[PDB]
Amino acid sequence: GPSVFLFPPKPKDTLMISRTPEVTCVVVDVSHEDPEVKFNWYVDGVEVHNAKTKPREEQYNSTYRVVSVLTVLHQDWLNGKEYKCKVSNKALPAPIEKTISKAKGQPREPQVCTLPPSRDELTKNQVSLSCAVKGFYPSDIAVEWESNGQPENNYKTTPPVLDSDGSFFLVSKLTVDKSRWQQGNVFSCSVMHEALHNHYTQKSLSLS
Amino acid sequence: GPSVFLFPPKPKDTLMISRTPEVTCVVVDVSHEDPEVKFNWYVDGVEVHNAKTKPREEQYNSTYRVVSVLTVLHQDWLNGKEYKCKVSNKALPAPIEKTISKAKGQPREPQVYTLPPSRDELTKNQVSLWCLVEGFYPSDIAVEWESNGQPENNYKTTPPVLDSDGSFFLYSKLTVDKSRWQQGNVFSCSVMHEALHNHYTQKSLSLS
Ligand SMILES: *[C@@H]1O[C@H](CO[C@@H]2O[C@@H](C)[C@@H](O)[C@@H](O)[C@@H]2O)[C@@H](O[C@@H]2O[C@H](CO)[C@@H](O[C@@H]3O[C@H](CO[C@H]4O[C@H](CO)[C@@H](O)[C@H](O)[C@@H]4O[C@@H]4O[C@H](CO)[C@@H](O[C@@H]5O[C@H](CO)[C@H](O)[C@H](O)[C@H]5O)[C@H](O)[C@H]4NC(C)=O)[C@@H](O)[C@H](O[C@H]4O[C@H](CO)[C@@H](O)[C@H](O)[C@@H]4O)[C@@H]3O)[C@H](O)[C@H]2NC(C)=O)[C@H](O)[C@H]1NC(C)=O
Numbered sequence: 174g175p176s177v178f179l180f181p182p183k184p185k186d187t188l189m190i191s192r193t194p195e196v197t198c199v200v201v202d203v204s205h206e207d208p209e210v211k212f213n214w215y216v217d218g219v220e221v222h223n224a225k226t227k228p229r230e231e232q233y234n235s236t237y238r239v240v241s242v243l244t245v246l247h248q249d250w251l252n253g254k255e256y257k258c259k260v261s262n263k264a265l266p267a268p269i270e271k272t273i274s275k276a277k278g279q280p281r282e283p284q285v286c287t288l289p290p291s292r293d294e295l296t297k298n299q300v301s302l303s304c305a306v307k308g309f310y311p312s313d314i315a316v317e318w319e320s321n322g323q324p325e326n327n328y329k330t331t332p333p334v335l336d337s338d339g340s341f342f343l344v345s346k347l348t349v350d351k352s353r354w355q356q357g358n359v360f361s362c363s364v365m366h367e368a369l370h371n372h373y374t375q376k377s378l379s380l381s
Numbered sequence: 382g383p384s385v386f387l388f389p390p391k392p393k394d395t396l397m398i399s400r401t402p403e404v405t406c407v408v409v410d411v412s413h414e415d416p417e418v419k420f421n422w423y424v425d426g427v428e429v430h431n432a433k434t435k436p437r438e439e440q441y442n443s444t445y446r447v448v449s450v451l452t453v454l455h456q457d458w459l460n461g462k463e464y465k466c467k468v469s470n471k472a473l474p475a476p477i478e479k480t481i482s483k484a485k486g487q488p489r490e491p492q493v494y495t496l497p498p499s500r501d502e503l504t505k506n507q508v509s510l511w512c513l514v515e516g517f518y519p520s521d522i523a524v525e526w527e528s529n530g531q532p533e534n535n536y537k538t539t540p541p542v543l544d545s546d547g548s549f550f551l552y553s554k555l556t557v558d559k560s561r562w563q564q565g566n567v568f569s570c571s572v573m574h575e576a577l578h579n580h581y582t583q584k585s586l587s588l589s
């Protein structure tokens with residue numbers, strides 16, 4: 174029988190009005206037999222009609238894969254609406270239903286703090302700048318660095334970590350050339366989270 | 382039939398000579414029809430005979446659980462020797478063999494940096510002290526906080542994060558009363574890792 178995998182939007186997509194959050198319903202192991210696949214979509218049990226389904230695509234294992242994509246309204250996802258994908262196929266005993274929704278829990282607003290390099294590390298070639306984000310809930314969050322109007326990619330961010338008070342924290346470490354910090358370039362940590370005003374805050378850091 | 386799980390020593394136990402590192406071989410789903418389990422232990426393929434096996438213990442699913450514990454020599458573990466557990470049971474077609482050893486790879490020394498709280502934060506009643514540990518390999522590590530020789534264990538530490546040069550980093554966040562910080566008490570981050578001199582370093586942090 175076919176199997177169904179239901180995927181959520183990316184957090185950043187739900188937090189920025191100009192992005193396009195989508196829920197993706199993927200069906201695999203569709204037979205030659207019985208290649209017809211029907212999608213029904215429901216939001217809080219109410220059927221919706223505007224999903225965009227793709228033609229089936231045969232895989233190297235001689236089975237078909239078919240994807241239906243539902244664009245969601247940012248505020249619907251953030252308000253906890255439940256998205257159900259129902260998949261019908263003649264080779265199935267009964268239609269398969271999957272339902273997905275945003276992580277639950279009372280939201281808590283992240284506090285964001287930039288931390289300059291240790292004075293030990295000024296003799297290293299590069300320095301590490303630190304963006305600590307603490308006290309947030311739920312754990313879905315996006316953290317990004319930039320400078321002079323361009324993204325700075327040479328960073329890594331820890332997973333969210335459950336703190337003692339039940340909130341999450343993480344740290345993002347941006348590595349830059351020392352000269353470039355000496356220089357006095359300003360670096361900025363952008364944080365996107367449902368519990369922030371405008372779902373966005375930025376903190377900047379430069380040599381003092 | 383039964384399942385076997387093989388667990389390494391704690392990092393701290395392998396790194397401090399006074400402590401006692403053990404490898405633990407756990408057998409679950411030992412049924413009453415076949416309750417007798419044989420453990421054969423090997424170090425680099427050579428059988429050793431000093432493991433201690435402890436009385437089988439009856440779980441709430443009525444099945445059993447038998448545990449053998451092998452004491453390891455610190456330098457054997459650190460030099461990459463392989464520890465093999467072989468579990469023999471009547472119910473089992475052939476004995477199950479599990480092998481474990483230290484995480485492989487060329488060691489790299491942790492760089493340890495303490496970062497004071499952000500000024501932003503001085504308005505709460507608690508402050509966050511950070512201990513940034515970067516550039517280390519393998520990921521086995523222990524990170525602890527103390528003040529005046531005593532454990533401060535009101536802290537949380539991120540998991541190791543694979544960094545863009547293939548080494549690891551993490552942060553440990555210690556939360557303390559603002560008063561303790563304001564009054565100048567000294568706090569210390571201690572790190573234990575195989576690539577450190579004496580497997581140990583400490584870095585302290587205080588207000589001017
Ligand atoms: C026949 O072949 C098919 C097709 O496979 C391909 O072709 C074959 C011939 C080989 O060449 C394969 O190597 C090829 O890939 C096989 O189909 C596979 O079946 C698996 C089940 O049997 C299924 O496993 C499940 O995978 C889930 C994760 O899927 C993610 O991540 C993987 C990488 O790990 C990636 O390959 C998948 O495509 C999928 O990727 C995500 O897709 C979603 C939807 O597009 C993305 O979300 C969207 O992203 C956009 C932006 O891009 C936007 O934000 C939207 O808002 C958002 O919705 C998402 O970004 C992608 N992520 C990544 C990282 O890429 C697992 O979660 C799942 O686990 C669950 O179930 C397990 C049991 O099955 C449990 O153990 C577990 O606990 C979980 O509950 C499964 O592991 C494969 O995904 C599926 N492959 C594809 C391509 O569909 C088929 O199996 C095979 N049949 C036979 C008989 O051999």
Ligand SMILES: *[C@@H]1O[C@H](CO[C@@H]2O[C@@H](C)[C@@H](O)[C@@H](O)[C@@H]2O)[C@@H](O[C@@H]2O[C@H](CO)[C@@H](O[C@@H]3O[C@H](CO[C@H]4O[C@H](CO)[C@@H](O)[C@H](O)[C@@H]4O[C@@H]4O[C@H](CO)[C@@H](O[C@@H]5O[C@H](CO)[C@H](O)[C@H](O)[C@H]5O)[C@H](O)[C@H]4NC(C)=O)[C@@H](O)[C@H](O[C@H]4O[C@H](CO)[C@@H](O)[C@H](O)[C@@H]4O)[C@@H]3O)[C@H](O)[C@H]2NC(C)=O)[C@H](O)[C@H]1NC(C)=O
Binds near residue numbers: 402
């Ligand atoms: C009947 O019941 C038993 C017992 O069930 C428990 O008790 C009952 C009363 C209920 O409460 C249950 O809910 C309880 O679980 C069932 O036994 C279980 O079988 C599972 C297999 O089906 C097995 O899953 C595997 O777990 C591995 C990790 O186990 C860790 O962590 C869990 C907690 O997350 C813990 O339950 C285990 O005890 C074990 O804990 C470690 O123990 C070692 C050994 O002592 C510790 O290491 C030693 O510690 C000492 C100090 O204590 C000292 O430091 C030594 O130096 C050191 O050696 C270690 O500290 C403990 N770690 C932690 C984190 O606690 C997984 O890794 C494994 O995954 C692997 O396989 C997967 C696929 O199978 C893969 O995804 C993956 O990649 C891995 O390869 C499995 O998931 C359960 O552990 C096991 N539970 C116990 C207690 O043994 C039994 O199955 C059930 N029967 C039936 C029919 O259901």
